[PDB]
């Protein structure tokens, strides 16, 4: 499912400089999903995840 794929993408992603890394990690998570201050950086990364989650929410060949 789409939610399962997003969870798999999140699992795949899990498997100054820190602020840039957090944005890169969010971008890397978004790239994998698309292909298929620390608190401020985490909030920006969470916002990217939230935007991806909204996009994520938005048989015949086998039986032939």
From Swiss-Prot:
Superkingdom of origin organism: Eukaryota
Signal peptide: none
Compartments, record wording: Nucleus, Nucleolus
Role noted for this protein: Involved in the biogenesis of the 60S ribosomal subunit.
Family designation: Belongs to the TRAFAC class OBG-HflX-like GTPase superfamily. OBG GTPase family. NOG subfamily.
Protein known as: Probable nucleolar GTP-binding protein 1
Highest classification ranks of the organism: Eukaryota, Fungi, Dikarya, Ascomycota, Taphrinomycotina
Name of the gene this protein is made from: nog1
Residues of the whole record sequence present: 14 to 161 of 642
């Amino acid at each position: 499912d789409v939610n399962t794929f997003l969870d798999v993408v999140l699992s795949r992603t899990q498997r100054s400089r820190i602020r840039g890394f957090y944005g890169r990690k969010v971008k890397f998570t978004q790239d994998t999903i698309t292909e298929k201050s620390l608190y401020r950086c985490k909030q920006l990364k969470r916002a990217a995840l939230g935007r991806m989650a909204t996009i994520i929410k938005r048989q015949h060949l086998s039986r032939l």
